[PDB]
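step 4 of 6: structure.
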Amino acid sequence: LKLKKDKRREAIRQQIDSNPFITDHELSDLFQVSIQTIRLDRTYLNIPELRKRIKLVAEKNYDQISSIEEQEFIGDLIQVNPNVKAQSILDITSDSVFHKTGIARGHVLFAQANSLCVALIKQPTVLTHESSIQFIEKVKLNDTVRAEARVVNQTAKHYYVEVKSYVKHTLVFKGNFKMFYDKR
Amino acid sequence: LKLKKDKRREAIRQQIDSNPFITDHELSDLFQVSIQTIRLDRTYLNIPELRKRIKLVAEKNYDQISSIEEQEFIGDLIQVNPNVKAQSILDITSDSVFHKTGIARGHVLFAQANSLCVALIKQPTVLTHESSIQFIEKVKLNDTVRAEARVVNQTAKHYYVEVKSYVKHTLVFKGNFKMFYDKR
Amino acid sequence: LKLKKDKRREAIRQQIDSNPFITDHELSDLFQVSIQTIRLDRTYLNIPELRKRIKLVAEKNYDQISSIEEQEFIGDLIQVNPNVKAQSILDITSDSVFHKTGIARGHVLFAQANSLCVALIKQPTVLTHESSIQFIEKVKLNDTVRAEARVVNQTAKHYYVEVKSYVKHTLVFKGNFKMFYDKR
Amino acid sequence: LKLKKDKRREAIRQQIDSNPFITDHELSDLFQVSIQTIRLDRTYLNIPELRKRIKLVAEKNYDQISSIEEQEFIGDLIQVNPNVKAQSILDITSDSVFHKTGIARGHVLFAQANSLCVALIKQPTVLTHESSIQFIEKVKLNDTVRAEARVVNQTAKHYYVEVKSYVKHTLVFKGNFKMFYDKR
Amino acid sequence: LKLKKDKRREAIRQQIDSNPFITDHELSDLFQVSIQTIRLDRTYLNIPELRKRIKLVAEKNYDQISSIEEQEFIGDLIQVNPNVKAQSILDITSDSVFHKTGIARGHVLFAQANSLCVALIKQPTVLTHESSIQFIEKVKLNDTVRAEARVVNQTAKHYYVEVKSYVKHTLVFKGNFKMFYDKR
Amino acid sequence: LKLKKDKRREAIRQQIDSNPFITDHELSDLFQVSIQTIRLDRTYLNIPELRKRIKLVAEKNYDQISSIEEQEFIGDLIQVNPNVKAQSILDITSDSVFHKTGIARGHVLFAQANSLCVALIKQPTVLTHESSIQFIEKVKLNDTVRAEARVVNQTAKHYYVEVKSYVKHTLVFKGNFKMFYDKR
Ligand SMILES: [Zn+2]
Ligand SMILES: [Zn+2]
Ligand SMILES: [Zn+2]
Ligand SMILES: [Zn+2]
Ligand SMILES: [Zn+2]
Ligand SMILES: [Zn+2]
Ligand SMILES: [Zn+2]
Ligand SMILES: [Zn+2]
Ligand SMILES: [Zn+2]
Ligand SMILES: [Zn+2]
Ligand SMILES: [Zn+2]
Ligand SMILES: [Zn+2]
Ligand SMILES: [Zn+2]
Ligand SMILES: [Zn+2]
Ligand SMILES: [Zn+2]
Ligand SMILES: [Zn+2]
Ligand SMILES: [Zn+2]
Ligand SMILES: [Zn+2]
Ligand SMILES: [Zn+2]
Ligand SMILES: [Zn+2]
Ligand SMILES: [Zn+2]
Ligand SMILES: [Zn+2]
Ligand SMILES: [Zn+2]
Ligand SMILES: [Zn+2]
Ligand SMILES: [Zn+2]
Ligand SMILES: [Zn+2]
Ligand SMILES: [Zn+2]
Ligand SMILES: [Zn+2]
Ligand SMILES: [Zn+2]
Ligand SMILES: [Zn+2]
């Protein structure tokens, strides 16, 4: 048997506090309850929908970055520790897919990744010098790609950044980035 | 001393017949004559401007390709030998540059290259699986990037394609692409 | 009395197999059941909504045509027998109506029809030479117009094509088209 | 020999007073003088370029019409005698041509014509009921099409309007329009 | 206890007849019944949604005004007594808000107000000469602002117009406008 | 008589060093020499055109401001002393004028002014509370409006800012702004 409405809702607040980015689908699977029930529950709880929460959190992050302007950034910058790590979320719309197939275009995922690497480095001048990438799974129209970047090495002239991207906890894309920086 | 008007113009026709894509700047340097003189000369000769000639030639090429639709293609497909080699030209407009610097965004050059590799392979299904790329020189607002792709290996399941890109005969970008294909 | 849920759903699959383009409204009228019930039923059946099915089928058709490029085509090409007959579907949006009245603009329906005639003829060069048309009923904002073209005569230099267009099986527009063609 | 600068310029003012829509090319042919000389002459004379003059005159005309809103009108309404005759000018841009050929799309010329017929009739409700049209010459990218409409018959319920369209005094398109009207 | 369905619906028709612009939220508060119940009720009653009714009424009003063109008007002109008073409604979309905060930009509310003052004056030439304005409350993304303009003085050369703007009967913006007019 | 080419050009560099925003028209009037001569001179001198220089200088200024995002700013921020004074330049395009007349819309000039006041104040939260404005001269299509803002009073809760706007050193618009600020 299932939780009483009240306890389901308490549990839903705890989940979202704990993961500000948890989806309604994830919440429905967790509590084994229709995706519509999740919506009514959030409404009752005064928790805004995922898009909004995502946009609220990201807005604060563009203040921490200096290499690229907010409106140039690809995706939503959900997390950033300058010079250490960062994450973005990007929805795949028809602009981003091949028209015959609905398969996401490679350069879109590369763009999300490259942008994130530029953004996480706290320098005036930050350019990508080299990159090698692997497209591990097809990404489809309407997917949401979470990219996660981290610095793996830092020399005097470069940062080496690894990016891994996911669609529902499935690794879809991996890349290595060699980033140049100077005090200018 | 310089060529008489008549002989300069004869020589200009021969050059363009010989390179349909030669620029007015290249023609001015060749004959050491203002870029405006080149224009008057072409007008007299009934040779259309570079943009037009480029668009006339490319139009015929989209007929030879099957992996990607014409209007999805990045740049102008100036040359194509299906399954062997191909070339595109792409102008760098403000859409393609970082706003602070006028430096072309990495994903734009990668997009030109990735598109070209997809286009040159004559299969129904063609996906990029892996890529490694080097950004050799900064590309600037208003540059024109010529990308040149060639197949270097072909196995039963993949084509390996090398792309090299230029701005006025200067190598600016290099990439290796691992492309998947099947009969579907 | 009405069909049990199970039998209604079986019957709904049979209908859609039989007419890939049947609407939810048509399905609701058939089974005398709310338009929302139809939606839940399709969801259960794993049958995508009308827009999608329409776009899946049409995508395959642009491969058969050569006179006009896919992205220039007006409406969705749902059916094509080159040089014989063809059909398109076109939604009437605010772009297509007079602003004071919501009445569809004449040139929009003519455009759907003219495009279809160009598309169905399998020649490199296909131009419309003459046309006579009758606007039989007002088409309104949000209507969907199904145009149906067929060749009625073929001489050495022309095809004569008749187009008839409908909104819910009501004839709204009729046209005769005199089409030129050559091997060029 | 040619006219002195002064007399050429006097003659140019007289021409434009006499035809507010005469082009610089027409003026150059008339006086056998480069198209650039015509420009310098107009500048000296304080006569604005063709586009402007066209837009100044047309602006006054939308006040006389009631069947269609100004911003819905196709082309520039250069002349109007409500219920009798009217004319528009329309530039053919890339939006209006087939992409492979630069040939103007049929529905564009039909749209100019149909709009003009709706505009010239001074009634609240004016709908096109029937039309037959002939595409007499190919219209190309960058052409300017002058459409000329006149009422040929008027019954109690309809106006019969003939439209003829030109590119440099060459008849390119002809149409007959059966227009419905009522007091509503 | 609450009204029977039938009587609620009768009462809802009377309300909308009486205020063509009453919202579903207002109707839900009145009858203490979910906003969704209001929707089902209107559907049953054949009363179109607020957006439509608003657009139907406003369409008739642009005929009465002469100083500014319909498509230039900011908001929907719901009410107009030329030279006396007028009202508009304007939705606040992301175009109209600061990006960090969702707060409506001042010039948007000023634009609604200034447009309304120009529109209500029945003269060929009508220009704003002076204005003083007070932003009384923050307007937020997705609010709907009702602006209400009235002439308070009229001299030989000017009209003095007061505008007051509201979001759910809360005064949010107030302005005084000094408007110039002549017979030209 | 006029300056030798060499001395004219020396003098032109000195002028632009001295006023980075001086126009070619201003330079032509100064040296009484065609606007085209000015262009050739700048080309020779390696001084970029006005648009570019303006965009280079402004780019550096958005770094100093915190109340409004760069891409939301109306016009180009050519000068800024946070909490003291600032200036913008704004071109008047067809988007900004009444369609019948080419006269700039009031809210456009108010927008330039209001944006500048928000931008110059170095606080997280900065809102306009009150404003009174005078439209002193008609601004026309293609004019360039220079707005100049300065703080005239500062209390604990507000800044009082005066804006004056010009087209070729002619005062066209004046405004007083009451701005709210807090540490949030
Ligand atoms: Zn998750
Ligand atoms: Zn699941
Ligand atoms: Zn397609
Ligand atoms: Zn892209
Ligand atoms: Zn490096
Ligand atoms: Zn070259
Ligand atoms: Zn050179
Ligand atoms: Zn910038
Ligand atoms: Zn891009
Ligand atoms: Zn592979
Ligand atoms: Zn049907
Ligand atoms: Zn029905
Ligand atoms: Zn309207
Ligand atoms: Zn159209
Ligand atoms: Zn023919
Ligand atoms: Zn003529
Ligand atoms: Zn000629
Ligand atoms: Zn094409
Ligand atoms: Zn069209
Ligand atoms: Zn009739
Ligand atoms: Zn109310
Ligand atoms: Zn309430
Ligand atoms: Zn922002
Ligand atoms: Zn605005
Ligand atoms: Zn005044
Ligand atoms: Zn100056
Ligand atoms: Zn001057
Ligand atoms: Zn107008
Ligand atoms: Zn505006
Ligand atoms: Zn205050």
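step 5 of 6: annotate
 - Chains F and C do not touch (no CB pair under 8 Å).
 - Chain F has two domains: 1-60, 61-184.
step 6 of 6: archive
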